[PDB]
Symmetry: D3
Subunit: 159 residues, 6 copies
């Protein structure tokens, strides 16, 4: 489907990457969702058990969805759009080195991008958008959504 | 799908309306389901956590399913038929004043109607059916399903 | 889903009611779609053979979708929202007397409403909207969608 | 889904086995559908081009649906239940020798069984039912569904 | 769908048959899943609450999926392929007498067969395969998957 | 789903870009499918009317699937993976200048990539693969899939 037909969406962290502290991961992911709930009527809640709408997973190589990871570098992550099962799920390539900042690959920034896909956003052709296909680091304190990003997400969920 | 392909169906009360006591809501909803399980092989169970087949929700205005509520009066509630995700979900317009009896809008009676939709029943053209499109109050102690209602639900689930 | 994920939609008149001339049925249905395409980016095309997104059917009593018609009066027609299979399909009760005027049930006016459902619109609580649940004849020459009708349909397909 | 949500169903013979004359294949398949339409409100129509609800195909070995045929003998055919895509589709193993008599494998008798699956019927444990899992030839002139066959099919489509 | 698009699959025992000790049932089922995870990248986890991918159920007669059981003998069990809802679910006919060994019907062996279906395997025509349609008892200590079984499951999930 | 569950797939060119001759568009699209059928058990057929598995469309700006094109440059095209409805559909941005050579954007080369998506292939991180995300012109006479392209496509359809 093009969008989640509800405002209360849940997510769950399937497993944790040993690259970061469990709570730094929770923080990065939660702040990532917060980026999108700030400009839409959507609200996100983390759950530890049961099925959630969006399952955040860390994995390497082939992990069952037929879109295997490629080791360090190259593809860093991917996610599926709204739907049942794997729909909305965001997978992070464990072969990358996830960090809270500019060392290795920043989890927060990458998560903001993937959640974009999870909510129904495709790639943007605007270099300022978080949905632009190329990864780059910017400080979390000064990071913000481009206008193209706001338009896209609001086109889908309004507010 | 036209029907739930199982006899054990679960439901969960997403949130409670502040118009009634939490337990009066539980009672109204549970008795509503009981009305249908009495004439079919179906059985309903309430769960507090995890995804349930039927999510009972209280909400106002636009709540994400693209069928926004209209404030007090007019549409009182709605529900989707059997299926994944929002399928089977029953939404109650919080702008209405829900009551245990004839004050405002009776939750039990409305719930019986919506659960009818949740189980796959459309609107009936018979004025005596609970599936008739027009809301009316009747005492819970003397309320009963019309023959048209029994035929419809049994046509779907038998017994 | 909540909407057809395309602007070019096809429909097919499965069979014709013997109440009107084939040419009149086609005209009425064509005009009904036109009402909605005039306020959205949508474009409609009629096909004579093969699968269409929207199948217009005339039937009576139980016709397979578990929402049996009730003979003369009452249920005049019904339609399923966007989706595969019967999704988007519009069924007209052949037990009604379809006409091009104010006598019997007006095909054109009923079609505009049904197509509203086929496009993803639910019932409106505004008495002036074509999506209001109650059928009524109105000058078929000065007929126009109500604001609520325009808002809702453009909320889905924009323009 | 458990059943086709309509009474008018279409089928298409994708390709013909070189074992029989085109006319004989058509006759056998037509007679097979007739068996079921005679005991239900269902009506079947063959189309020569385009998508049908039920696609009849002759294939051998691995043919794309992950349920590869086994060459001569063993699996004679299989079909998917009601649904979109390959749902309802019936596949006949071209490695079998299809005939109009008791030699080789009888097309007509195998078709009645396969169509049972296409309509939503699973295997029966009654030795006298066409849905019993074991293929056997029987006088194709006095052939008739068993009671279990009638009950099950009318349990889905009634009449 | 043809396969579960993930390597971590969960299952849950809906209810227990009174024929065996609760833990003997857990053991039989768990060992059954182990048989398949041994030759694939798949991994299975039991959960007590929430929805699981594969729901193991004990039931008699008609239980809602339109594939009613037939009492003692005949059909012993069945399961649906990968998918949402009932997809992947394995149902065991309670009218059979389930045992840890050769008395009555062996639960472990039957479970290995049904889970095969749950993972997307159809019936095999090879008499040595666990996916062969006919039930037979062999000691759990010397039971092993046929080559045909290994090929099928690995064709779907690799490794 | 991850893949088309059949070896015979149909496609239809919904409309033609005015940039090239109808004959050239057909040739380019035909050659694009040929690239993939040459390395898999798949067979492709073009149909002029009716529903195809893969619908090739030329469009500009917002065209209904919520993934609007961006005018000249940037997004050249996109396609949906295997599935019903728009599943498998390939959209080409009419704002691009489609050609049979190295000027403008080469239709054939872009089609091979898009069809990769339509068949279930995601983007590759190998610079030599047609599925790499970056469009580039290459001698359309010595063009050949990269090993990564062959592995991935045969991983889904084999051969
Ligand atoms: O490293 C790369 O950029 C290429 C690689 N990319 C990825 O896998 C991915 C790149 C991103 C991504 C993350 C953050 C931002 C972003 C935007 C704006 N402000 C801050 C952050 C943009 C994209 C997610 S996966 C890739 C290679 C090959 C094929 C597909 C993708
Ligand atoms: O108030 C109304 O009746 C109109 C309004 N209705 C609703 O929203 C609704 C009305 C009902 C309903 C509730 C109970 C009963 C019933 C039947 C038999 N015995 C006891 C109770 C019937 C319908 C649910 S939502 C409405 C307005 C505009 C468009 C659609 C619906
Ligand atoms: O006399 C009878 O037996 C019943 C007759 N049915 C009817 O007249 C019916 C009247 C209605 C009805 C529909 C909508 C609303 C409504 C009003 C305001 N806001 C929202 C919704 C009220 C009534 C449904 S059937 C009938 C007869 C024969 C066959 C079918 C129906
Ligand atoms: O209205 C009835 O007679 C009851 C019956 N209704 C229907 O089947 C239907 C009523 C309509 C309908 C058609 C046109 C208009 C309309 C609005 C504004 N201007 C012009 C035309 C409104 C509704 C379509 S089906 C019904 C019965 C039971 C449950 C729901 C609806
Ligand atoms: O000799 C061989 O290798 C095996 C041969 N396969 C067979 O004969 C086969 C026999 C059966 C079989 C099917 C159903 C039942 C049955 C009986 C009673 N109640 C329910 C179900 C028993 C057996 C399947 S394949 C075969 C050979 C070549 C190709 C395919 C199959
Ligand atoms: O029967 C076989 O040779 C085994 C094979 N079976 C099949 O493929 C099939 C057997 C049948 C079948 C056809 C007709 C009748 C029938 C019933 C009553 N009166 C007349 C006709 C029963 C079954 C269709 S496919 C098979 C192999 C492996 C797994 C399941 C089934
Ligand atoms: O009792 C029978 O075999 C027929 C009956 N079968 C079933 O319901 C079923 C039979 C089985 C089955 C269980 C274990 C094994 C097996 C294979 C290899 N090694 C050890 C164990 C094979 C099949 C599951 S349900 C049946 C009757 C009628 C219609 C369909 C099926
Ligand atoms: O100048 C502009 O405004 C932006 C222009 N857009 C672009 O040039 C764009 C460049 C890219 C891009 C795509 C993939 C990769 C990449 C590289 C390596 N590994 C993986 C992925 C890098 C960039 C997307 S749009 C544009 C203009 C007008 C309309 C659309 C796009
Ligand atoms: O490449 C661009 O100009 C950016 C844009 N890309 C596209 O739309 C697209 C790029 C391609 C593509 C076509 C052919 C080849 C290829 C590979 C090897 N040998 C020959 C040909 C690679 C990619 C299809 S759409 C884009 C923008 C924003 C987000 C994703 C992609
Ligand atoms: Ca990587
Ligand atoms: Ca790592
Ligand atoms: Ca209201
Ligand atoms: Ca209230
Ligand atoms: Ca009527
Ligand atoms: Ca009539
Ligand atoms: Ca065979
Ligand atoms: Ca043959
Ligand atoms: Ca039994
Ligand atoms: Ca028992
Ligand atoms: Ca463009
Ligand atoms: Ca152009
Ligand atoms: Zn993944
Ligand atoms: Zn991305
Ligand atoms: Zn709602
Ligand atoms: Zn209602
Ligand atoms: Zn209908
Ligand atoms: Zn209506
Ligand atoms: Zn097949
Ligand atoms: Zn069969
Ligand atoms: Zn069952
Ligand atoms: Zn089996
Ligand atoms: Zn598009
Ligand atoms: Zn691409």
């Amino acid at each position: 489907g093009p969008v989640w037909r509800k405002h209360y969406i849940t997510y769950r962290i399937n497993n944790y990457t040993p690259d970061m502290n469990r709570e730094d991961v929770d923080y990065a992911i939660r702040k990532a969702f917060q980026v999108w709930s700030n400009v839409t009527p959507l609200k996100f809640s983390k759950i530890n058990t049961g099925m959630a709408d969006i399952l955040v997973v860390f994995a390497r190589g082939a992990h069952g969805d037929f879109h295997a990871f490629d080791g360090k570098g190259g593809i860093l992550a991917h996610a599926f759009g709204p739907g049942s099962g794997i729909g909305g799920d965001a997978h992070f390539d464990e072969d990358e080195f996830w960090t809270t900042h500019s060392g290795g690959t920043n989890l927060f920034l990458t998560a903001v991008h993937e959640i974009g896909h999870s909510l129904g956003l495709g790639h943007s052709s605007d270099p300022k958008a978080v949905m632009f296909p190329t990864y780059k680091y910017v400080d979390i304190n000064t990071f913000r959504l481009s206008a193209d990003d706001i338009r896209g997400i609001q086109s889908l969920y309004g507010d």
